[PDB]
Design a protein around this ligand. Structure first.
Ligand SMILES: [Zn+2]
Ligand SMILES: [Zn+2]
Ligand SMILES: [Zn+2]
Ligand SMILES: [Zn+2]
Ligand SMILES: [Zn+2]
Ligand SMILES: [Zn+2]
Ligand SMILES: [Zn+2]
Ligand SMILES: [Zn+2]
Lengths: 64, 497, 194, 179, 80, 79
């Protein structure tokens, strides 16, 4: 469930995305779980290759 | 207006009521001294002691409530220090030879600290006063009393740790009490008691480490500051180094096998682990040595030991060509595990020797055992005590050793327990002998003389060979002893510079 | 095997660690879950045995210390969160069955940086904060009694069960709502409830 | 005799530790009449300095260095007072802080005397003594920076502090014995 | 009959914008909201609170505890 | 008979010297020398049967040429 919620959040922001912490805040708000749980889901998704890290701006993350 | 009034009113009053009368007593000191004595039985709500304690509490808190060094806080703190010092001095004189010195000491610390928190509220300066008072009380004591106290502290720590490790069900209570009780012992930091206490801690921790760890580091994490020369941590560092050495030895063996196979092709066993100790930070009595291995050991074990010694020698080679060389003296210490019949037994090295002797024989004479042993027979009897017990399968009857007839499947851990040593005019004789040797050595050199460290080297060598060409006279000297004796001689004007 | 082959060098140990990590990642979610649960159970069972048992214990305990360095490869991976969740659930019962011994603090001083949110350290610190609160409650009682004595002294001038309390933060302990007391007077004796 | 005072008498049986008065906590040499204890400089050298006159408690630079050392000692005393005047801290932090204060005070005192000193090679001793004392000073300062009580409750680096204190103690013993 | 010699009881202390500067949790930083032209990203910490990097930078430069739970603040570096 | 399953032997290692303190640097000889101590530190001895740090005596010989204990010439007695 966290994975699909995060996928929807990343898709909504498009080519702008967000800094990871802002995205955690968005998902936690949409929940109504721990920040670490969301970060774990994020890492698993990144390993799956659905999302990538913006090389130019490592702070923000970019879906692909 | 406040500051003016309060200063002028209270500060003379405290400066006058905290001054020690010629007898050695002040007023607030007397009140606070009465506080604890009445608090002994000041728990019943309907009793005069309750009102008395409440009144003293209110007085003290009103007096101290102004602080945010200070003008009046100094005097009240010193009064608390004096009270605590007198209390601890009295108690210490009372029961310094009891078999329960250390729990009572810790309980007294707890009572004094709780009383201070009740009388003045939570403040750090009063805690500092309490620590200083305990230290001062400890200091003003004769030497033998201090030595006994240090021995008792070390024995207590060792007993608690050993009980926690062996005792299963109440061991948790012992360990919790130990962690609670460690705090008073930290008072010894910054005294000569630290020096005399490190010694006995060394002696007991050696046996604990050999017989059985991981709790020792935990204890050292909070009692660390107390030890001046830091030898206890050095022991654990030594254990780690020994493990690294074993790994290196394995790699060396593999390399040698590879070289042998290259040269050739160019055309059910006991598990032995070896532990190496440094002499800087490990107490080993030279009576515990093993001199002739083949005389008291089987052949395979001797082969393994010999090959390890060869590895050590060959590893001591590189810039180290210039400098002294290292060796290996084997000791009777250590532990061993045997599997006899159904049961599994744990013994020490000497006990392993005694037991393996029975492999092809049904009886041995104690006289023959001690004759072949070349060890002090008191050690033999000490190691034989647990063997001749009920669990031990051996009995010595007038005596000759014989087997215990069978009578299940449980490990039997039989090892001698630690034999605590008690402090009972040797120092005078030792000083005299060292001095006489010194004066002879310095009389031998005329006006040519010697350097201070040269004289040190000569006296140290003489004592290493020993003034004995005897046993009544002859311990190992240190440079501190040489410097002390030469200080006495200089004071006698016998040496000039 | 690595040390025998390539000698002791730095980068090969890091290679070994990264290999183990990558292998744990190439797994299914159910299996990651089961593995994490097995790790938590292993720690709990070793500590239980060592504290309870005697010499077999002290034997098992040095082994326990050896085996931790493999476990610690988990840090920084995804599996950390599930491992920590499982660890909390046994550390709870262990702390309520026995006070916070040396063992729990030592294991944590080894493997602490693995736990992402640092929940176990917070449980341990909670026990200590509670002892401090006990001290303060004692003092507060004394102050109340002093006020009573003073008021009565101005008007005039005009064999028990020991009990200790423990407070736990719900941000760190897994206390199920099934485990509660609702009408405390009804289900408990009188003096206790007082 | 004890000079501060108090009427207790002091005797030294061996140079294992080094002694102050058990009651008041003061040290003086038995050789010459001078209240303080002068480790590096002989009684004659101290007598020449005091007869010629110097700071108390090239030649200009000496005085400057001695004032700097005594000022640092004052700083250590001020730190001890400030920590002692807080309204109970964890035990290990408190005991280490008291020990560090005592060590820094004694080390700065003996280092000031070693500056006052002038085939002698005590220069390396005074040099590494300065190095170690300055390192421990910097560590304490780093652990000093808003609310003191919270800072002490926070604190590890404590191990480094213990190491430095042991170093200072060993070197002080070395200077005392060698002198 | 039975008698109690000791006992231990248990209880819980049952009781969200950027509390330190009180602006809305997802909104901008008031310190820089006075100086219009909004650069503070949110910061997370192990103690599971979310605050503004500006707020926290200043506050920490002053004091070295978490202003909300009395623990040494630790900048969360997991998942990063 | 009686069968062994594991043994742990214990040994010490022995010098041939009784110095226990380096004179040049006044630190305990088995510990590291002063310079190494501030920030592979071996002991060496001479035919004069005086032992010192390798680094201590190296610096002293960069300074002088007489052994600091016996007013004699130095020999890096090898093995
Ligand atoms: Zn005095
Ligand atoms: Zn003098
Ligand atoms: Zn904010
Ligand atoms: Zn902002
Ligand atoms: Zn927080
Ligand atoms: Zn040296
Ligand atoms: Zn060196
Ligand atoms: Zn020589």
């Amino acid at each position: 469930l966290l994975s699909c919620l995060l996928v929807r959040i990343l898709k909504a922001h498009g080519e702008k995305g967000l800094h990871i912490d802002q995205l955690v805040c968005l998902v936690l708000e949409a929940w109504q779980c721990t920040s670490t749980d969301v970060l774990s889901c994020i890492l698993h998704l990144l390993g799956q290759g659905y999302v990538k890290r913006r090389d130019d701006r490592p702070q923000i993350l970019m879906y692909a | 207006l406040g500051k003016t009034c309060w200063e002028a009113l209270v500060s003379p009053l405290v400066q006058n009521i905290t001054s020690p009368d010629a007898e050695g007593v002040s007023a607030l000191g007397w009140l606070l001294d009465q506080y604890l004595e009445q608090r002994e039985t000041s728990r019943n709500p309907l009793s005069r002691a309750a009102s008395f304690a409440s009144r003293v509490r209110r007085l003290c808190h009103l007096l101290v409530h102004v602080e945010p060094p200070s003008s009046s806080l100094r005097n009240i703190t010193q009064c608390w220090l004096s009270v605590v010092q007198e209390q601890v001095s009295r108690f210490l004189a009372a029961a310094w030879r009891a078999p329960d010195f250390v729990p009572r000491y810790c309980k007294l610390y707890e009572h004094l600290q709780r009383a201070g928190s009740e009388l003045f509220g939570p403040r750090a300066a009063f805690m500092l006063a309490l620590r200083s008072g305990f230290s001062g009380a400890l200091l003003q004591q004769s030497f033998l009393t201090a030595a006994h106290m240090s021995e008792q502290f070390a024995r207590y720590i060792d007993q608690q740790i050993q009980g926690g490790l062996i005792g299963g069900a109440p061991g948790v209570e012992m360990l919790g009490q130990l962690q609670r009780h460690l705090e008073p012992i930290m008072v010894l930091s910054g005294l000569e008691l630290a020096t005399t206490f490190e010694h006995f801690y060394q002696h007991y921790m050696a046996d604990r480490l050999l017989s059985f760890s991981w709790l020792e580091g935990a204890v050292l994490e909070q009692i660390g500051l107390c030890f001046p020369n830091r030898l206890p941590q050095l022991m654990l560092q030594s254990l780690s180094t020994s493990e690294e050495l074993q790994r290196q030895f394995h790699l060396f063996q593999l390399q040698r096998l590879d070289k042998l196979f290259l040269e050739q092709e160019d055309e059910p066993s006991p598990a032995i682990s070896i532990l190496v100790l440094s002499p800087r930070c490990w107490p080993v009595s030279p009576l515990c040595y093993l001199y002739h291995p083949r005389k008291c050991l089987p052949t395979e074990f001797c082969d393994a030991l010999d090959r390890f010694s060869s590895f050590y020698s060959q590893s001591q080679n590189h810039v180290l060509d210039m400098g002294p060389h290292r060796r290996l003296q084997w000791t009777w210490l250590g532990r061993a595990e045997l599997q006899f019949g159904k049961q599994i037994l744990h013994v020490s090295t000497v006990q392993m020797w005694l037991l393996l002797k029975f492999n092809q024989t049904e009886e041995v004479s104690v006289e023959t055992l001690l004759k072949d042993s070349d060890l002090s027979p008191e050690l033999l009897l000490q190691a034989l005590v647990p063997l001749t017990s009920g669990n031990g399968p051996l009995t010595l009857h007038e005596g000759v050793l014989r087997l215990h007839e069978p009578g299940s499947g449980e490990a039997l851990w039989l090892i001698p327990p630690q034999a605590y040593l008690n402090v009972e005019r040797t120092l005078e004789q030792k000083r005299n002998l060292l001095s006489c040797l010194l004066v002879r050595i310095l009389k031998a050199h005329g006006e040519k003389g010697l350097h201070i460290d040269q004289l040190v080297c000569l006296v140290l060598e003489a004592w290493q060979k020993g003034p004995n060409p005897g046993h009544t006279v002859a311990v190992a000297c240190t440079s501190t002893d040489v410097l002390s004796c030469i200080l006495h001689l200089l004071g006698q004007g016998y040496v000039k510079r | 095997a690595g040390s025998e082959l390539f000698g002791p060098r730095a980068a090969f140990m890091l290679a070994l660690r990264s290999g183990f990590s990558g292998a744990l990642l190439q797994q299914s979610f159910l299996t990651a879950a089961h593995m994490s649960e097995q790790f938590a159970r292993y720690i709990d069972q070793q500590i239980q045995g060592g504290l309870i048992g005697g010499a077999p214990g002290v034997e098992m305990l040095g082994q326990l210390q050896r085996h931790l360095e493999p476990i610690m490869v988990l840090s920084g991976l995804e599996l950390a969160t599930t491992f920590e969740h499982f660890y909390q659930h046994y550390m709870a019962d262990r702390l309520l069955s026995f006070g916070s011994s040396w063992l729990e603090g030592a294991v944590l001083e080894q493997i602490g940086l693995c736990f992402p949110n640092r929940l176990p350290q917070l449980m341990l610190q909670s026990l200590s904060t509670s002892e401090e609160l006990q001290r303060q409650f004692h003092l507060f009682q004394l102050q109340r009694l002093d006020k009573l004595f003073l008021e009565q002294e101005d008007e005039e001038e005009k064999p028990s069960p020991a009990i200790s309390i423990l407070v736990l933060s719900p941000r760190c302990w897994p206390v199920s709502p099934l485990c509660y007391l609702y009408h405390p007077r009804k289900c408990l004796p009188t003096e206790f409830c007082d | 005799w004890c000079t501060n005072g108090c009427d207790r008498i002091l005797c030294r049986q061996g140079l294992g530790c080094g002694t102050t008065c058990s009651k008041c906590g003061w040290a003086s040499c038995f050789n010459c009449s001078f209240p303080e204890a002068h480790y590096p400089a002989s009684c004659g050298h101290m007598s020449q300095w005091v007869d010629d006159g110097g700071y108390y408690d090239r030649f200009q630079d000496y005085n400057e260095r001695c004032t700097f050392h005594h000022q640092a000692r004052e700083f250590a005393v001020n730190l001890r007072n400030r920590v002692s005047a807080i309204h109970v801290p964890p035990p290990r932090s408190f005991t280490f802080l008291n020990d560090a204060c005592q060590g820094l005070e004694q080390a700065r005192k003996v280092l000031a005397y070693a500056c006052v000193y002038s085939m002698d090679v005590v220069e390396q001793q005074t040099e590494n003594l300065e190095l170690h004392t300055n390192a421990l000073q910097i560590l304490l300062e780093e652990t000093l920076l808003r609310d003191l009580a919270s800072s002490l409750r926070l604190l590890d680096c404590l191990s480094t502090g213990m190491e430095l204190l042991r170093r200072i103690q060993e070197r002080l013993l070395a200077i005392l014995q060698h002198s | 009959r039975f008698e109690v010699k000791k006992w231990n009881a248990v209880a819980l202390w049952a009781w969200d914008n950027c509390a330190i500067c009180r602006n809305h949790i997802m909104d901008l930083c008031i310190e820089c909201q006075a100086n219009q032209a909004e650069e503070c990203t949110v910061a997370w910490g192990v103690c599971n609170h979310a605050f503004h990097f500006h707020c926290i930078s200043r506050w920490l430069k002053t004091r070295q505890v978490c202003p909300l739970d009395n623990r040494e603040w630790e900048f969360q570096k997991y998942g990063h």
